[PDB]
Every structure is written in C-alpha cells, then in structure tokens.
C-alpha cells in the first residue's frame, strides 16, 4: 500500500466500485488511512481520489469513501476545467463546478466546507453558479454556504450567475437576500454583467428587485455597457426607467447605433441607421430647447468625417455602407471616450475588413489610430504590432508599396512598446514573468519583422533617416530575449519563429539587408548571448549555405567588416569556425579573417594563465577574455 494510488485514482476516474472494494482488504487504522488519504502528484492536478471522484460525477466512489469511514472531505486540491486550474478545490468545489448534485448531496450530508475559499476565493457556491444548476445552488444556500463571500476581485456569486446566462439561479439568489447592488474592485454591479451578456430576463428581475444604476470605473453606466456590446434588447428595458434623462437616452442610442456597424458578430447596417435616427430625432425635435452634440475635431483616421449633426446629413448616410462604419467609429469614440478599453476593438475590426477587401490604404490609417489609442492607455500592444507586420507583409507580397510614414509610425510605436515591455519585465515578480517575457519576445520579433519590411521598401532619404533613427533608439536600448539574443542575434539566427499568417510570405531571417541596417544603426556587432555565442557564432550555424548563399556571404562580409571578432570564444571554448555546421560557412569565414599576433598572444595568455589583471592594458583585459 506504499504507493498504490494508481489503482484508486483509475477506479475513481470512471467511478469503479468493485475495483475499490477489492483494493480495500481488512486494514487496521494505519494502513487504512495510508490507503484512503494517499494523494499523488499527476502534474497539473492534486490527484486525490476524492477530486476525480467528484469531477467525473461518480457518487458511488465517494459513497464508499464516506459511509463507514469519513475520508478527508476538506482535501485541498487543484482541478482543471479548461484553463481554470484553481487550488483549494475540495470535492464540493469541483463537484459544484462540474454540476453533479449526487456527489454534493453525499458531501454536505456529512458536513463539508460549503464556504471553502481558494487562491481566488471562489466559493463552491460560485462554482455552482458558474455551472448554472439551480438544484446545487439552493442546496448550498439552504446549508448556509456564505452567499456574501466574494472572490479576490469582488465578483459575488450573483454577478457570475448574471453573466453566464442562468436566470433561474439569479432569481433564486435575489430571492434569498443577496446583494443586487454589489460592487467590484473596478466596478461591476449586477446590471453591468447581465447587460454586457445581454440577458433580458436577468435585467428584468434585477430592476424588479431595485438593483439601482451606478457608473463603472471606466465611466460606464449599465445602459452604456448594454449599448456598447450591441445588445439592443436589454437597452430598451433599461430605457424604460424614465430616470436616465434624455442626456443618457440620446447617449445610449447613439452608442449602440454606432456599435452595430463596427462590430464582428451582429454587424447590421439596417440596425445602424435606425438607431442613429432614433438617437438624433430625440434632440432635433423638441421646440426651443433642442440639444446639439458636443463638437468633435475631424479625426484624420475616419476619412476626415466630422460626423453628422443634421437630419439631412444623417439621411445622406443611408446610401453608403462605407460611410456608416466610419460614422459608427466616430460616434463610439465620441461617447465611449479615447481611454476606454473596448473603444479600440471596433477600429481594428473595421481596419481588418478593409484589409480583407484589399483596401489596405484605409486599413493602415484605422489601425494606426487604434494603436495610438491603445498605446496612450498603457495597454498591451504586443499583438497590434504583429497585425501591422502581417498587413505590411501582405502589402509587399501582392504588388503594393507601403508608405514610409506608415512604417515610421509603426516602428516608433514598436520601440515605445518594447521599452514599456522591458519596464514591465523589470518591474514585476515571478508571478507573471513568463507571460510578460513571452510578450516581450513577441514584441521584439514584431519589431524585427517591421525592420525586414522596411528594408524591402524603397523610400526617400528623409524617410530612411527617420526609420534608421527609430531603429537606432531601440539598438541603444539594448534589448535581449530570455536566452540572451540581442536584436542582432535574432536577425542572423534561422531559428527565430517568423509568424505564419502573412509575414511568412515576405520575411526571411536571416537577412542581409536587416543585419546591414542594424550594423549601420550601431548594433553591438561583438555582443554575446546568455551562452556566449556572438553574432558570428550563430550565423555560421546555418542550414542552407548552398541556396541562400547570397544572404550568408553578405552577412559574414558585413559582420566582420563591422568589427566582429572572428576568433571569439563562447562558454564552451569554441571559435566561430570551430562552431561551423557546414563547409561553405567556414570557408567564407576563413576568407574573411586575418591572422593577428594580438589574437595569437591572447590565446597563449588564456591557455597558460598569467593572472592578466594588471601588467596588461585595460582594453586588452577584455580582449584576453574574448579568446
């Protein structure tokens, strides 16, 4: 019984009973407890018998485990429902999350931790509400399962019940003295989640229970949240309160009539003009008290359209689906603000549609505006630069010449984003270093793709000077990946993952043009990575020096003429021609290197050690370390 947990875990995985009954055979206290309580690792979970006995919905295994002996119901464990590996998940928690009433009835009957917290303070009742079953929720509440207990971010079980689409448990929770007006760390009142998801009935019984209306942390009223996600059904209910005033009525109407046009799922031009007309008509027919919208400067991204503030002007837009999208973008930015989280996505989607229609000229404009909005919000723009690289590669691939100001702007935003990513990496603990460093490497790769696109685009002298300055700034910032590769080591490495969407079409690392641009921008031609491989140790290890020779000769003749040391030594004591995977790449190196008695004497000093701290010039003290 030393480690025979495989039998019990496999039997409980499918809920086998006779296998467990044969497993238990006339045990006294010591070995019976050592069997029943024997947890194991099974990486990713905690592998207790009574975690998979409840996750798979098998009350018989828990029944034999809890009938004549009381196994540890309060067993700390981690269980996964997709990417939801949450610690502290006892049998009650995982059972409620999966949604099995039988095993829950076989846990609380003996007395279980109905309010068992976790790292996220997710009560078992919250997991049941996420599942949505009414039977488990009322069973927990009737056993005093701490309805008021929230998560870390104050996300009480009512809010997750009102977001995942479970009207029954919402009605029951409101019927059992819950908190309709419960807030959150950022502000997520119970109307916000239901309005965002768009459930009509949940908002119906919330406003029937006087859930009240309070503004979100992002300056969002529940009606504005409802209108933001294009849910026109819930807005009509919230507009019936007759306490929002016409300032919010004509705000929400414009907001959703703008959201419908520039949205992915429920994109409807017919359901856009109707709501925009219903919006403006409220303020353009009242008498001598008509309301005119606040002025908005003509944004260059949206075709220099100053929006429409007339019934005749709006009527002129119900003939041009190309103009209603821009008008929706303008109205959404005017109402949602320039700092909201979700104001960026419609702009990116409209630019993506323009790109899919091969109209990249307006796609670049819209996405540049979206990138500026995202970067002036301290947001994570580690994918927008990738989408720019994909658009630029698709433009270069077909026949199209990208504008040089576009590459200048995207490169400037890229160096700003990479500096920001370095700041986040340096200013964070190991809780999220993995994802932050992955985003940092992604940002570096996107900058490299943008540089490769810039090399393959002819532009005037001023444009090239601007692009070279933008590259030079990041070169002097000295960025390095997790394995020590600088911004030049990746431009010569063939193992750098080029994105497969469209940058795979035209971006081929290693590049001669990219490495020449980097070396002409002040790149450390003689730097080393974490192991010690310099910019020359990496290119020499090339797969194809018989077909891609032109960018292997023009990346060795350019490295060694920029000051790269052909006799350098990495950690494993290997010169670049000692680290040659081919012959055509060491012949070129042996042609592009010269015998210097400085290198020979440095090798002699490094071999027969001399204690070269003093009695040597300061600059040669690193030269000896090179070899």
């Amino acid at each position: 019984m030393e480690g025979l947990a495989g039998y019990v875990y496999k039997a409980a995985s499918e809920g086998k009973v006779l296998t467990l009954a044969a497993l238990l055979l006339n045990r006294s206290e010591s070995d019976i407890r050592y069997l029943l309580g024997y947890v194991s690792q099974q990486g990713g979970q905690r592998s207790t018998p009574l975690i998979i006995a409840a996750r798979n919905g098998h009350a018989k295994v828990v029944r034999l485990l809890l009938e004549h002996y009381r196994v540890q119901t309060q067993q700390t464990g981690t269980v996964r429902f997709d990417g939801y590996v949450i610690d502290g998940a006892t049998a009650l928690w995982c059972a409620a999350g999966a949604g099995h009433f039988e095993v829950v009835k076989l846990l609380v009957s003996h007395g279980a931790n109905v309010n068992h917290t976790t790292v996220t303070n997710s009560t078992p009742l919250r997991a049941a509400c996420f599942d949505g079953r009414l039977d488990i929720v009322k069973y927990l509440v009737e056993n005093n399962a701490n309805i008021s207990i929230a998560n870390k971010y104050d996300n009480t079980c009512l809010m997750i019940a009102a977001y995942k689409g479970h009207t029954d448990v919402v009605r029951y929770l409101l019927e059992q003295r819950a908190d309709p007006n419960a807030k959150a760390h950022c502000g997520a009142t119970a109307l916000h989640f239901a309005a965002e998801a768009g459930h009509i009935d949940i908002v119906k019984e919330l406003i029937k229970w006087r859930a009240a209306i309070v503004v979100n942390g992002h300056g969002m009223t529940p009606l504005k949240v409802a209108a933001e996600s294009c849910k026109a059904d819930v807005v009509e209910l919230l507009l019936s309160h007759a306490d929002c005033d016409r300032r919010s009525r004509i705000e929400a109407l414009e907001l959703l009539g703008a959201s419908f046009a520039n949205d992915r799922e429920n994109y409807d031009i017919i359901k856009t003009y109707h709501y925009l007309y219903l919006a403006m008509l409220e303020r353009f027919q009242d008498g001598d008290n008509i309301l005119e919208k606040e002025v908005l400067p003509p944004i260059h991204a949206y075709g220099n359209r100053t929006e429409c503030r007339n019934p005749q002007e709006l009527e002129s837009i119900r003939q041009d689906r190309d103009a209603l999208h821009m008008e929706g973008l303008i109205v959404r930015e005017r109402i949602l603000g320039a700092d909201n989280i979700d104001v960026s996505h419609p702009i990116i989607y409209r630019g993506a549609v323009y790109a899919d229609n091969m109209e990249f000229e307006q796609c670049i404009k819209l996405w540049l505006h979206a990138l500026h909005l995202r970067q002036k919000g301290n947001r994570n723009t580690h994918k927008d630069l990738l989408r720019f690289a994909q658009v630029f590669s698709q433009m270069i691939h077909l026949n199209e010449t990208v504008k040089a100001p576009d590459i200048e702007c995207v490169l400037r935003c890229s160096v700003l984003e990479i500096e920001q990513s370095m700041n986040r990496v340096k200013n964070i603990s190991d809780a999220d270093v993995h994802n932050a460093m992955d985003n940092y490497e992604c940002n570096l790769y996107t900058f490299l793709y943008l540089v490769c696109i810039s090399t393959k685009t002819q532009c005037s002298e001023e444009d090239q000077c601007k692009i070279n300055k933008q590259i030079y700034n990041l070169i002097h910032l000295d960025p390095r990946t997790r394995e020590g590769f600088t911004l030049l080591h990746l431009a010569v490495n063939s193992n750098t993952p080029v994105d497969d969407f469209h940058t795979n079409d035209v971006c081929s690392f290693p590049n001669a043009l990219v490495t020449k641009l980097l070396l002409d921008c002040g790149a450390e031609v003689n730097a080393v990575d974490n192991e010690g491989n310099s910019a020359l140790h990496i290119i020499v290890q090339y797969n194809r020096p018989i077909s891609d020779f032109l960018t292997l000769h023009s990346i060795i003749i350019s490295l060694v003429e920029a000051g790269a040391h052909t006799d350098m030594t990495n950690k494993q004591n290997k010169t670049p021609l000692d680290k040659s995977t081919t012959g055509v790449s060491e012949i070129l190196l042996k042609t592009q290197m010269k015998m210097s008695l400085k290198c020979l004497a440095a090798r002699a000093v490094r071999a027969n050690d001399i204690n070269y701290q003093d009695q040597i010039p300061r600059t040669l003290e690193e030269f000896v370390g090179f070899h």
Binding site: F81, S122, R126, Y153, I160, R387, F501
Partner: peptide
C-alpha cells in the same frame, strides 16, 4: 482573412469560476 484573426481578442480573472 484578417477579420477572422480578430475573434481571438474577444484574458481576465474577474469573470472566471
């Protein structure tokens, strides 16, 4: 399609279980 790649942006632990 570029618009198809936008469906992946529709991560926060607030609304998790």
């Amino acid at each position: 399609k570029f618009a198809d790649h936008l469906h992946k942006f529709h991560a926060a632990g607030d609304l998790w279980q």
